[PDB]
Amino acid sequence: MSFLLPKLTSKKEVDQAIKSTAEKVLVLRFGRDEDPVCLQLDDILSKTSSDLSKMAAIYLVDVDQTAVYTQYFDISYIPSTVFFFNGQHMKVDYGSPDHTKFVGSFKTKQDFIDLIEVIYRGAMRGKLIVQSPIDPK
């Protein structure tokens, strides 16, 4: 049963999601619904959101419609996904120098599910930085 990922449309809405959301990892996908690679990611985000309801809330954000945040996260490539937890911007080690955001899509649906667990636990255990259990794509 497909699920329609919510959408934040303005700076304000994104602020609210960051404050509102609690105890779960806020997943903010900055991109464009139309974009191909974004389409690939959203599918993965769609087919896993349900199974992740317990520890993650996912939203899609248009990079054109919310430039301040796009700028604030220093986003240049799309899709770019940022993770938050109870208001805290979470850092993930993946591999590259930018621990601030995951750039691109995931090889599989399991990757993302895995990454989310690492974040959830690390975050639940009071950490602010965690290591990626996977690889990009």
Side-chain angles (χ1 to χ4, degrees), residues 73-108 110-121:
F73 294 137
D74 198 40
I75 294 176
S76 293
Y77 289 92
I78 60 165
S80 273
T81 302
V82 178
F83 304 90
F84 271 74
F85 187 91
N86 286 317
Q88 289 167 157
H89 186 340
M90 293 291 311
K91 296 190 153 194
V92 178
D93 206 326
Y94 315 132
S96 238
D98 193 357
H99 302 173
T100 276
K101 51 185 178 289
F102 172 101
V103 176
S105 186
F106 299 83
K107 299 172 178 175
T108 60
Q110 196 56 46
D111 281 1
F112 175 70
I113 305 161
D114 286 321
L115 177 58
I116 296 299
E117 303 203 16
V118 176
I119 299 172
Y120 185 70
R121 289 199 254 285

Short mmCIF file of all heavy atoms in Angstrom, two decimals, residues 73-121, unseen atoms left out:
data_model
loop_
_atom_site.label_atom_id
_atom_site.label_comp_id
_atom_site.label_asym_id
_atom_site.label_seq_id
_atom_site.Cartn_x
_atom_site.Cartn_y
_atom_site.Cartn_z
N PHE A 73 21.82 24.88 4.23
CA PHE A 73 22.44 23.56 4.24
C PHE A 73 23.52 23.44 3.18
O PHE A 73 24.10 22.37 2.99
CB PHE A 73 21.38 22.48 4.02
CG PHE A 73 20.39 22.38 5.14
CD1 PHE A 73 19.03 22.22 4.87
CD2 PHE A 73 20.81 22.43 6.46
CE1 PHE A 73 18.10 22.11 5.90
CE2 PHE A 73 19.90 22.32 7.50
CZ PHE A 73 18.54 22.16 7.22
N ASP A 74 23.79 24.57 2.51
CA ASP A 74 24.80 24.66 1.47
C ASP A 74 24.60 23.55 0.45
O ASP A 74 25.54 22.83 0.11
CB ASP A 74 26.20 24.57 2.08
CG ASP A 74 27.29 25.09 1.14
OD1 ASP A 74 27.08 26.12 0.45
OD2 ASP A 74 28.38 24.47 1.10
N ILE A 75 23.37 23.42 -0.03
CA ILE A 75 23.00 22.40 -1.00
C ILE A 75 23.26 22.84 -2.44
O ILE A 75 22.75 23.86 -2.87
CB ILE A 75 21.51 22.04 -0.85
CG1 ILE A 75 21.28 21.38 0.51
CG2 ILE A 75 21.08 21.15 -2.01
CD1 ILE A 75 19.82 21.04 0.81
N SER A 76 24.04 22.05 -3.17
CA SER A 76 24.38 22.34 -4.56
C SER A 76 23.90 21.26 -5.51
O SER A 76 23.53 21.54 -6.64
CB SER A 76 25.88 22.48 -4.73
OG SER A 76 26.31 23.64 -4.04
N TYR A 77 23.93 20.01 -5.05
CA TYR A 77 23.47 18.89 -5.85
C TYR A 77 22.15 18.41 -5.25
O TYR A 77 21.94 18.53 -4.04
CB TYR A 77 24.47 17.73 -5.78
CG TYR A 77 25.76 17.99 -6.52
CD1 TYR A 77 26.85 18.55 -5.86
CD2 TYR A 77 25.88 17.71 -7.88
CE1 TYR A 77 28.03 18.83 -6.53
CE2 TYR A 77 27.05 17.99 -8.57
CZ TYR A 77 28.13 18.55 -7.88
OH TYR A 77 29.30 18.82 -8.54
N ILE A 78 21.26 17.88 -6.09
CA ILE A 78 20.01 17.33 -5.59
C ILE A 78 19.92 15.92 -6.11
O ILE A 78 20.44 15.61 -7.17
CB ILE A 78 18.76 18.08 -6.09
CG1 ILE A 78 18.69 18.02 -7.61
CG2 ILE A 78 18.76 19.50 -5.56
CD1 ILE A 78 17.33 18.41 -8.16
N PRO A 79 19.29 15.02 -5.34
CA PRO A 79 18.68 15.32 -4.04
C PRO A 79 19.70 15.37 -2.91
O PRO A 79 20.74 14.73 -2.98
CB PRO A 79 17.71 14.17 -3.86
CG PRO A 79 18.45 13.05 -4.48
CD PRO A 79 18.94 13.66 -5.76
N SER A 80 19.40 16.15 -1.88
CA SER A 80 20.26 16.25 -0.71
C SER A 80 19.35 16.02 0.48
O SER A 80 18.32 16.67 0.62
CB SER A 80 20.91 17.63 -0.59
OG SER A 80 22.13 17.70 -1.31
N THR A 81 19.73 15.09 1.35
CA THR A 81 18.89 14.80 2.49
C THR A 81 19.55 15.14 3.80
O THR A 81 20.69 14.75 4.05
CB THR A 81 18.47 13.34 2.46
OG1 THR A 81 17.78 13.08 1.23
CG2 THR A 81 17.57 13.01 3.64
N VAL A 82 18.83 15.87 4.63
CA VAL A 82 19.34 16.26 5.93
C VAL A 82 18.56 15.52 7.01
O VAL A 82 17.37 15.23 6.84
CB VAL A 82 19.21 17.78 6.14
CG1 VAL A 82 19.70 18.15 7.51
CG2 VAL A 82 20.02 18.51 5.08
N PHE A 83 19.22 15.21 8.12
CA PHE A 83 18.58 14.48 9.20
C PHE A 83 18.60 15.26 10.49
O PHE A 83 19.63 15.82 10.86
CB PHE A 83 19.26 13.13 9.42
CG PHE A 83 19.32 12.26 8.19
CD1 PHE A 83 20.40 12.34 7.32
CD2 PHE A 83 18.27 11.37 7.91
CE1 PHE A 83 20.44 11.54 6.17
CE2 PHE A 83 18.30 10.56 6.77
CZ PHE A 83 19.39 10.64 5.90
N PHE A 84 17.47 15.28 11.17
CA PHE A 84 17.33 16.00 12.43
C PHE A 84 16.73 15.09 13.48
O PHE A 84 16.06 14.10 13.16
CB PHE A 84 16.39 17.19 12.26
CG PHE A 84 17.06 18.45 11.84
CD1 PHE A 84 17.50 18.62 10.53
CD2 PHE A 84 17.21 19.50 12.75
CE1 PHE A 84 18.09 19.82 10.13
CE2 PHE A 84 17.80 20.71 12.37
CZ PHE A 84 18.24 20.87 11.05
N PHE A 85 16.94 15.43 14.74
CA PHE A 85 16.39 14.66 15.84
C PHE A 85 16.13 15.56 17.03
O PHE A 85 17.06 16.07 17.65
CB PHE A 85 17.35 13.53 16.24
CG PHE A 85 16.77 12.59 17.26
CD1 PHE A 85 16.07 11.45 16.85
CD2 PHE A 85 16.92 12.83 18.62
CE1 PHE A 85 15.54 10.56 17.78
CE2 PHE A 85 16.39 11.95 19.57
CZ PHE A 85 15.70 10.81 19.15
N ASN A 86 14.84 15.75 17.34
CA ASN A 86 14.39 16.62 18.42
C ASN A 86 15.00 18.01 18.31
O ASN A 86 15.41 18.61 19.31
CB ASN A 86 14.69 16.00 19.79
CG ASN A 86 13.75 14.84 20.12
OD1 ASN A 86 12.54 14.92 19.89
ND2 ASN A 86 14.30 13.75 20.66
N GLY A 87 15.05 18.51 17.08
CA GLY A 87 15.57 19.83 16.82
C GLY A 87 17.05 19.88 16.51
O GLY A 87 17.56 20.92 16.09
N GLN A 88 17.74 18.76 16.69
CA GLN A 88 19.17 18.71 16.45
C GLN A 88 19.56 18.19 15.06
O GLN A 88 19.16 17.10 14.66
CB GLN A 88 19.83 17.85 17.53
CG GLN A 88 19.87 18.52 18.91
CD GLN A 88 20.24 17.56 20.03
OE1 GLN A 88 20.72 17.98 21.09
NE2 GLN A 88 20.02 16.26 19.80
N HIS A 89 20.36 18.99 14.36
CA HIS A 89 20.87 18.65 13.03
C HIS A 89 21.87 17.49 13.21
O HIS A 89 22.94 17.67 13.79
CB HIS A 89 21.57 19.87 12.45
CG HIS A 89 22.00 19.71 11.03
ND1 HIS A 89 22.16 18.48 10.44
CD2 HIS A 89 22.34 20.63 10.10
CE1 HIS A 89 22.57 18.64 9.19
NE2 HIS A 89 22.68 19.94 8.96
N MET A 90 21.54 16.30 12.73
CA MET A 90 22.44 15.16 12.90
C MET A 90 23.52 15.04 11.82
O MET A 90 23.25 15.27 10.64
CB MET A 90 21.64 13.84 12.94
CG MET A 90 20.72 13.65 14.14
SD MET A 90 21.58 13.41 15.72
CE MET A 90 22.79 12.13 15.28
N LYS A 91 24.72 14.67 12.22
CA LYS A 91 25.81 14.49 11.28
C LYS A 91 26.04 13.01 11.04
O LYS A 91 26.00 12.23 11.98
CB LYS A 91 27.07 15.14 11.83
CG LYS A 91 26.96 16.63 11.99
CD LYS A 91 28.31 17.22 12.29
CE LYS A 91 28.38 18.66 11.83
NZ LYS A 91 29.79 19.14 11.80
N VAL A 92 26.28 12.62 9.79
CA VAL A 92 26.52 11.22 9.44
C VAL A 92 27.84 11.12 8.69
O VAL A 92 28.09 11.89 7.77
CB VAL A 92 25.40 10.65 8.54
CG1 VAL A 92 25.73 9.20 8.18
CG2 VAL A 92 24.07 10.71 9.26
N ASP A 93 28.66 10.14 9.07
CA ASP A 93 29.98 9.96 8.47
C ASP A 93 30.10 9.40 7.06
O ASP A 93 31.15 9.57 6.45
CB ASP A 93 30.85 9.12 9.39
CG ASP A 93 32.33 9.40 9.21
OD1 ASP A 93 32.77 9.69 8.07
OD2 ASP A 93 33.07 9.32 10.22
N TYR A 94 29.08 8.74 6.53
CA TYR A 94 29.16 8.18 5.17
C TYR A 94 30.61 7.83 4.88
O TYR A 94 31.09 6.76 5.23
CB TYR A 94 28.70 9.19 4.11
CG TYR A 94 27.44 9.94 4.44
CD1 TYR A 94 27.38 11.32 4.30
CD2 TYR A 94 26.32 9.28 4.93
CE1 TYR A 94 26.24 12.04 4.67
CE2 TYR A 94 25.17 9.98 5.29
CZ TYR A 94 25.14 11.36 5.16
OH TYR A 94 24.02 12.06 5.58
N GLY A 95 31.29 8.77 4.22
CA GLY A 95 32.69 8.59 3.90
C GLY A 95 33.31 9.94 3.59
O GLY A 95 34.34 10.31 4.15
N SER A 96 32.66 10.68 2.70
CA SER A 96 33.13 11.99 2.26
C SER A 96 33.25 13.02 3.39
O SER A 96 32.79 12.79 4.51
CB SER A 96 32.21 12.53 1.16
OG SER A 96 32.96 12.80 -0.02
N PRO A 97 33.87 14.17 3.10
CA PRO A 97 34.05 15.24 4.09
C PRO A 97 32.79 15.94 4.60
O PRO A 97 32.80 16.50 5.70
CB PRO A 97 35.01 16.20 3.38
CG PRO A 97 34.66 16.01 1.94
CD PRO A 97 34.55 14.52 1.84
N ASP A 98 31.72 15.93 3.83
CA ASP A 98 30.50 16.60 4.27
C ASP A 98 29.62 15.64 5.06
O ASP A 98 28.92 14.81 4.49
CB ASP A 98 29.72 17.16 3.08
CG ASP A 98 28.62 18.13 3.49
OD1 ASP A 98 28.41 18.33 4.72
OD2 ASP A 98 27.97 18.69 2.58
N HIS A 99 29.65 15.77 6.39
CA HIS A 99 28.85 14.92 7.26
C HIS A 99 27.50 15.56 7.51
O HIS A 99 26.65 15.00 8.18
CB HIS A 99 29.55 14.75 8.61
CG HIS A 99 30.93 14.17 8.50
ND1 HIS A 99 31.77 14.06 9.58
CD2 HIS A 99 31.61 13.68 7.44
CE1 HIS A 99 32.92 13.53 9.19
NE2 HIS A 99 32.85 13.29 7.90
N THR A 100 27.31 16.75 6.94
CA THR A 100 26.10 17.52 7.13
C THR A 100 24.87 17.03 6.37
O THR A 100 23.75 17.25 6.80
CB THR A 100 26.39 19.02 6.80
OG1 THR A 100 26.96 19.66 7.97
CG2 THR A 100 25.15 19.76 6.37
N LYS A 101 25.08 16.34 5.26
CA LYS A 101 23.97 15.87 4.46
C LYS A 101 24.36 14.70 3.57
O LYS A 101 25.50 14.57 3.17
CB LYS A 101 23.48 17.01 3.58
CG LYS A 101 24.60 17.69 2.77
CD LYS A 101 24.07 18.90 2.00
CE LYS A 101 25.18 19.63 1.24
NZ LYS A 101 26.12 20.37 2.13
N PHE A 102 23.39 13.83 3.28
CA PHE A 102 23.65 12.72 2.39
C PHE A 102 23.23 13.19 1.01
O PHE A 102 22.09 13.63 0.81
CB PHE A 102 22.83 11.49 2.80
CG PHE A 102 22.90 10.36 1.81
CD1 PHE A 102 23.73 9.26 2.03
CD2 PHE A 102 22.15 10.40 0.63
CE1 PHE A 102 23.82 8.22 1.09
CE2 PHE A 102 22.22 9.36 -0.30
CZ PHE A 102 23.06 8.27 -0.08
N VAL A 103 24.15 13.13 0.05
CA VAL A 103 23.87 13.57 -1.31
C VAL A 103 23.63 12.39 -2.24
O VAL A 103 24.41 11.44 -2.27
CB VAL A 103 25.04 14.43 -1.84
CG1 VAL A 103 24.80 14.81 -3.29
CG2 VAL A 103 25.17 15.69 -0.98
N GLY A 104 22.54 12.45 -3.00
CA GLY A 104 22.22 11.37 -3.92
C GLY A 104 21.08 10.47 -3.46
O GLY A 104 20.23 10.86 -2.66
N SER A 105 21.06 9.26 -4.01
CA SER A 105 20.04 8.27 -3.65
C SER A 105 20.73 7.05 -3.06
O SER A 105 21.96 7.01 -2.97
CB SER A 105 19.23 7.86 -4.87
OG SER A 105 18.17 7.00 -4.50
N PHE A 106 19.95 6.06 -2.65
CA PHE A 106 20.52 4.84 -2.07
C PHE A 106 20.52 3.66 -3.03
O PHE A 106 19.59 3.50 -3.83
CB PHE A 106 19.76 4.48 -0.78
CG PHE A 106 19.84 5.53 0.28
CD1 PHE A 106 18.98 6.63 0.26
CD2 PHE A 106 20.82 5.48 1.27
CE1 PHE A 106 19.10 7.65 1.20
CE2 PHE A 106 20.95 6.50 2.21
CZ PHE A 106 20.08 7.59 2.17
N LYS A 107 21.57 2.85 -2.96
CA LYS A 107 21.70 1.68 -3.83
C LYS A 107 20.42 0.85 -3.75
O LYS A 107 19.82 0.51 -4.77
CB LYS A 107 22.90 0.83 -3.39
CG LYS A 107 24.24 1.56 -3.46
CD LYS A 107 25.37 0.73 -2.84
CE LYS A 107 26.71 1.45 -2.95
NZ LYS A 107 27.81 0.73 -2.26
N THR A 108 20.00 0.54 -2.52
CA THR A 108 18.79 -0.25 -2.32
C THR A 108 17.86 0.40 -1.30
O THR A 108 18.13 1.50 -0.81
CB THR A 108 19.11 -1.66 -1.81
OG1 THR A 108 19.80 -1.58 -0.56
CG2 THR A 108 19.96 -2.39 -2.82
N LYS A 109 16.77 -0.28 -0.99
CA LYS A 109 15.84 0.24 -0.02
C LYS A 109 16.36 -0.09 1.38
O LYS A 109 16.10 0.63 2.34
CB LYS A 109 14.46 -0.37 -0.23
N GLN A 110 17.12 -1.19 1.49
CA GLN A 110 17.66 -1.64 2.77
C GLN A 110 18.71 -0.68 3.32
O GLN A 110 18.79 -0.46 4.53
CB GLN A 110 18.26 -3.05 2.64
CG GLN A 110 18.49 -3.76 3.96
CD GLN A 110 17.22 -3.87 4.79
OE1 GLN A 110 16.16 -4.22 4.28
NE2 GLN A 110 17.32 -3.57 6.08
N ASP A 111 19.52 -0.15 2.41
CA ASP A 111 20.56 0.82 2.78
C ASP A 111 19.94 1.90 3.66
O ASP A 111 20.31 2.08 4.82
CB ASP A 111 21.14 1.47 1.53
CG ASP A 111 22.15 0.59 0.84
OD1 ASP A 111 22.38 -0.53 1.33
OD2 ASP A 111 22.72 1.04 -0.19
N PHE A 112 18.98 2.61 3.08
CA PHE A 112 18.27 3.68 3.76
C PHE A 112 17.66 3.22 5.08
O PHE A 112 17.75 3.92 6.09
CB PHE A 112 17.17 4.23 2.83
CG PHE A 112 16.31 5.27 3.48
CD1 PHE A 112 16.82 6.53 3.78
CD2 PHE A 112 15.00 4.98 3.84
CE1 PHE A 112 16.04 7.48 4.44
CE2 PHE A 112 14.21 5.92 4.49
CZ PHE A 112 14.74 7.17 4.79
N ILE A 113 17.04 2.05 5.10
CA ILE A 113 16.45 1.54 6.33
C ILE A 113 17.57 1.37 7.36
O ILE A 113 17.43 1.74 8.52
CB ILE A 113 15.76 0.19 6.11
CG1 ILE A 113 14.73 0.34 4.99
CG2 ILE A 113 15.08 -0.27 7.39
CD1 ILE A 113 14.30 -0.97 4.36
N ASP A 114 18.70 0.83 6.91
CA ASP A 114 19.83 0.65 7.79
C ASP A 114 20.35 1.98 8.30
O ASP A 114 20.46 2.19 9.52
CB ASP A 114 20.97 -0.10 7.09
CG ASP A 114 20.67 -1.59 6.92
OD1 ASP A 114 20.09 -2.19 7.86
OD2 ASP A 114 21.03 -2.16 5.86
N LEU A 115 20.65 2.89 7.38
CA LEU A 115 21.15 4.20 7.78
C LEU A 115 20.27 4.85 8.84
O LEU A 115 20.77 5.44 9.81
CB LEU A 115 21.25 5.14 6.58
CG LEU A 115 21.70 6.56 6.94
CD1 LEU A 115 23.06 6.49 7.64
CD2 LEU A 115 21.79 7.42 5.70
N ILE A 116 18.96 4.73 8.65
CA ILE A 116 18.01 5.33 9.57
C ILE A 116 18.11 4.73 10.95
O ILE A 116 17.93 5.44 11.94
CB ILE A 116 16.57 5.18 9.05
CG1 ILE A 116 16.42 5.97 7.75
CG2 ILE A 116 15.57 5.69 10.10
CD1 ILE A 116 16.66 7.44 7.88
N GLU A 117 18.40 3.43 11.03
CA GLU A 117 18.54 2.77 12.33
C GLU A 117 19.75 3.32 13.07
O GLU A 117 19.66 3.67 14.24
CB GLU A 117 18.67 1.26 12.16
CG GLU A 117 17.51 0.62 11.39
CD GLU A 117 17.34 -0.87 11.70
OE1 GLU A 117 17.91 -1.33 12.72
OE2 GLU A 117 16.63 -1.56 10.94
N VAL A 118 20.88 3.38 12.38
CA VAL A 118 22.10 3.90 12.98
C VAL A 118 21.82 5.28 13.55
O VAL A 118 22.20 5.59 14.69
CB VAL A 118 23.21 4.03 11.93
CG1 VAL A 118 24.45 4.67 12.54
CG2 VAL A 118 23.54 2.67 11.36
N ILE A 119 21.13 6.11 12.77
CA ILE A 119 20.81 7.46 13.22
C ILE A 119 19.89 7.41 14.42
O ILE A 119 20.14 8.04 15.43
CB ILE A 119 20.11 8.29 12.11
CG1 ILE A 119 21.04 8.44 10.90
CG2 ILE A 119 19.74 9.67 12.64
CD1 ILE A 119 20.38 9.08 9.66
N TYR A 120 18.81 6.65 14.31
CA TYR A 120 17.86 6.54 15.40
C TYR A 120 18.48 6.12 16.73
O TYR A 120 18.24 6.74 17.77
CB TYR A 120 16.76 5.57 15.03
CG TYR A 120 15.69 5.53 16.09
CD1 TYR A 120 14.84 6.61 16.28
CD2 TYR A 120 15.54 4.41 16.92
CE1 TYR A 120 13.87 6.59 17.27
CE2 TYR A 120 14.57 4.38 17.91
CZ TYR A 120 13.74 5.47 18.09
OH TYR A 120 12.78 5.46 19.07
N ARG A 121 19.26 5.04 16.70
CA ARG A 121 19.90 4.56 17.91
C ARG A 121 20.93 5.58 18.39
O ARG A 121 20.86 6.05 19.53
CB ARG A 121 20.57 3.20 17.67
CG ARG A 121 19.58 2.03 17.50
CD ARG A 121 20.27 0.68 17.74
NE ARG A 121 20.51 -0.09 16.51
CZ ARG A 121 19.56 -0.74 15.84
NH1 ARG A 121 18.30 -0.73 16.27
NH2 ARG A 121 19.88 -1.42 14.74
#
